[PDB]
C-alpha cells in the first residue's frame, strides 16, 4: 500500500503528467501557453451545475480484474472508445466505496478483489472517497441521471480558455482556439493524455481537504485544463488548419460549445452519444469537486 503524501499522489514523480509537443516531452502547462483565442459575438454563461445523484450503482461482484483507469481515460480521450457505459466496472468501483472492502486499486489502475500483496495500491480510505463519487459514472446512461450534455461545456470553456477576470465574472465570449501545430497534433495529444494516470489526480481531488487540496487545485490546474482541451476538441463543431506564413495553425471553433457531433473525423477523437453521456457525467462530478 502506497502512503498518500500530504500534497497528494500527484506530487510523486511516478505520477507526472506530460505531453509530447511535436514529439518532445513538455508539461501540459507549457503546451497551454501556445494556445491563443479569438472571441466571437456569442457569449458563454455558466449556470450552476445540478448536484449529482446520491445513488451509487449496486456493488455486485464481478469476475476478473477491472481496468478502471484505462476505462475512464479511454472513454474521455481514446480514439473511438467502446462500451463506455457498460455497468460492471463501475459496480466494482462502488465496491471500492464500501467502508471495509476487500477490493484494492492498484497504482496500475486495475481493481483486484484479492488483497494482492504483490502489487502496490492506493490507501483504501482515499479510494473510498474517490469511488464514493466516481462510481456515479455508472449512472451516466440511465435516463433518470443523464447529465446536461450542453450547458456543462460552458464551464469547460471557462476553466480552459477563460481569462482570470472572466473566470471571476462567470461569463466569457465564446472563443476560437488556435496554435502552431504539427501533422496530427490533436490525435497525438489525446494519445499523450489517454496514457495519463488520472486516478492519481481524481483520488487526490477527492481525498485531500483544506490547504493541501486548494494547493492541489493550483498545482494541477494545467492538467485539468489539458483533459478539458481534449474533450473540447472532441466536441468542437469544426477544426481546421490555417496556413500562416510557413507555419500551420490548428484552429478549433469553438471552445466551450458542445456541437454534439458524433461522426468520426480526421482532426480529432470523436464522441458517440454514449461518450457524450459519459463525458458530461464526468464533467458534472469533476467540476462539482473542483468548485468547493
Amino acid at each position: 500500500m502506497l502512503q498518500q503524501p500530504t500534497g497528494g499522489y500527484t506530487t510523486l514523480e511516478q505520477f507526472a503528467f506530460t505531453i509530447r509537443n511535436d514529439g518532445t516531452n513538455a508539461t501540459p502547462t507549457q503546451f497551454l501557453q501556445l494556445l491563443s483565442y479569438e472571441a466571437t459575438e456569442n457569449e458563454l454563461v455558466k449556470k450552476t451545475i445540478p448536484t449529482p445523484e446520491t445513488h451509487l450503482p449496486s456493488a455486485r461482484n464481478v469476475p476478473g480484474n477491472v481496468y478502471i483507469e484505462d476505462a475512464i481515460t479511454q472513454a474521455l480521450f481514446g480514439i473511438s472508445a467502446q462500451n463506455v457505459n457498460a455497468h460492471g466496472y463501475f459496480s466494482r468501483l462502488s465496491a471500492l466505496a464500501l467502508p471495509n472492502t476487500s477490493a484494492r486499486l492498484g497504482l496500475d489502475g486495475v481493481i483486484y478483489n484479492s488483497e494482492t500483496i504483490n502489487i502496490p495500491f492506493y490507501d483504501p480510505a482515499a479510494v473510498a472517497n474517490f469511488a464514493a463519487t466516481y462510481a456515479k459514472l455508472g449512472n451516466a446512461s440511465t435516463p433518470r441521471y443523464r447529465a446536461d450534455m450542453i450547458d456543462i461545456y460552458a464551464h469547460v470553456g471557462l476553466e480552459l480558455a477563460g481569462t482570470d477576470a472572466e473566470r471571476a465574472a462567470g461569463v466569457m465570449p465564446v472563443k476560437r482556439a488556435k496554435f502552431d501545430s504539427w501533422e496530427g497534433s490533436l490525435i497525438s495529444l489525446s494519445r499523450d493524455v489517454v496514457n495519463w494516470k488520472i486516478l492519481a489526480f481524481l483520488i487526490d481531488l477527492c481525498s485531500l481537504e483544506g490547504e493541501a487540496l486548494r494547493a492541489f487545485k493550483t498545482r494541477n490546474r494545467d492538467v485539468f485544463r489539458m483533459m478539458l482541451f481534449i474533450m473540447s476538441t472532441a466536441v468542437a463543431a469544426n477544426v481546421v488548419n490555417r496556413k500562416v506564413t510557413k507555419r500551420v495553425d490548428r484552429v478549433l471553433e469553438y471552445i466551450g460549445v458542445n456541437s454534439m457531433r458524433t461522426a468520426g473525423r480526421t482532426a480529432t477523437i470523436t464522441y458517440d452519444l454514449s461518450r457524450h453521456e459519459f463525458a458530461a457525467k464526468f464533467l458534472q462530478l469533476t467540476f462539482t469537486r473542483w468548485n468547493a
Binding site: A263, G264, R265, T266
Partner: protein
Amino acid sequence: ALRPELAFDHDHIIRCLMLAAANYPRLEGIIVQINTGYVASANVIRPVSE
C-alpha cells in the same frame, strides 16, 4: 459522416469555367443542355396540336 474524397474546389472550378468560357465555344451549349434536359424532366410544358 465523412466521405473519403476531395473537397469540391470552388475557387478552381470557377477559374477553369472562365478559361473554358474564354476558349471553348461549346461551353454555353453544354450548360444549356443540362438546363434544357431539366426543363424536360420537370415535365412542365408540352405542345398540343390544338
